[PDB]
Design a protein around this ligand. Structure first.
Ligand code: AD5
Lengths: 269, 43
């Protein structure tokens, strides 16, 4: 089993309120990865032990080119260490903020990768529930990587009740206190596509109540610069009725995705 | 910051890793993990 002395620590990559992430190189294979370091005492005091356990269980069992890999994990006297795939191009949200909005090629590519990753999750009855730019990282060739599974759930049989995710991304069914299923991720994919292309989420408002109102009315107002193809896809995802939302296979097959995506699969061993 | 983690040396290493992927499934995936119930117990 691994210990911290099996790794050369390179530099901090990010800071959290439970620990830190470092660029690290495991000495044996000279293999560069990220190490997320969490403090056992802080996790217990905050009462998030079962929460972290769930996140680890879900992510450690997923193997997909557009899902950040968790290679393994270990612990010592004070700390829990997660061995994670390093995403060389970093935060997707930072890239979006830098550019303001993404072009159609970039956005369609991300949408294909997202739909593929989410399909993989849904095949295993894992619902993500918090798709947004801030939860996505980028690989060596700019490939989308779902990086966080904080609101995720393995939901084999029962519909879910938990309101979760992020204000601007919440599906109508959550706001209305209905049960939800995997189709929440479909809705969030639509919001994401809109934000990619526009640089702001579709239901942006000064108050939580007005945002809620816009979401449940699907008060969608497309900017004039958007292509018919992109509006078609967004409109097909942002449906009030979950069963009417375009399936993930449908997103991958959508003509706008086909015409604009430049997706490349990473080399495999 | 060690040399391997900064300028060109990092870039080249990252490129090398992308084009020459190791078998992570056996190099890390077969190696034992602490039980998730043990994570907050004795190491
Ligand atoms: C697992 N965790 C990872 C990162 N951690 C992030 C930062 C901590 C919380 C959000 C995730 N960053 C990763 N990649 C980065 C690559 C370059 C980054 N930089 C930003 C610009 O300056 C150069 C370094 C930052 C993160 N990869 C990763 N794998």
């Amino acid at each position: 089993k691994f210990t911290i002395d099996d790794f050369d620590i390179g530099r901090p990559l990010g800071k959290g309120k439970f620990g830190n992430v470092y660029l690290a190189r495991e000495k044996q294979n000279k293999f560069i990865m990220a190490l997320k370091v969490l403090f056992k005492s802080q996790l217990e005091k905050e009462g998030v032990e079962h929460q972290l356990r769930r996140e680890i269980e879900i992510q450690s069992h997923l193997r997909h080119p557009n899902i950040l890999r968790m290679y393994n994990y270990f612990h010592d006297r004070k700390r829990i260490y997660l061995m994670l795939e390093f995403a060389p191009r970093g935060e997707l949200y930072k890239e979006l903020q830098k550019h303001g909005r993404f072009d159609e090629q970039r956005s369609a590519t991300f949408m294909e990768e997202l739909a593929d990753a989410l399909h993989y999750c849904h095949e295993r009855k894992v619902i993500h529930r918090d798709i947004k730019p801030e939860n996505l990282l980028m690989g060596y060739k700019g490939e989308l990587k779902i990086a966080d599974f904080g609101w995720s759930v393995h939901a084999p049989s029962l519909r879910r009740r938990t309101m979760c995710g992020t204000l601007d991304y919440l599906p109508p069914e959550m706001i209305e206190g209905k049960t939800h299923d995997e189709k929440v991720d479909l809705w969030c994919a639509g919001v994401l596509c809109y934000e990619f292309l526009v640089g702001m989420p579709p239901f942006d408002s000064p108050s939580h109540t007005e945002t809620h109102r816009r979401i449940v009315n699907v008060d969608l107002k497309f900017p004039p610069f958007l292509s018919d193809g992109s509006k078609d896809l967004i409109s097909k995802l942002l449906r009030y009725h979950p069963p009417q939302r375009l399936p993930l296979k449908g997103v991958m097959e959508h003509p706008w995705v086909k015409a604009n995506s430049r997706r490349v699969l990473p080399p495999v061993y | 910051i060690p040399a391997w983690a900064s300028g060109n040396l990092l870039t080249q290493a990252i490129r090398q890793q992308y084009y020459k992927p190791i078998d992570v499934d056996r190099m890390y995936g077969t190696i034992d993990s602490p039980k998730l119930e043990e994570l907050f117990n004795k190491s």
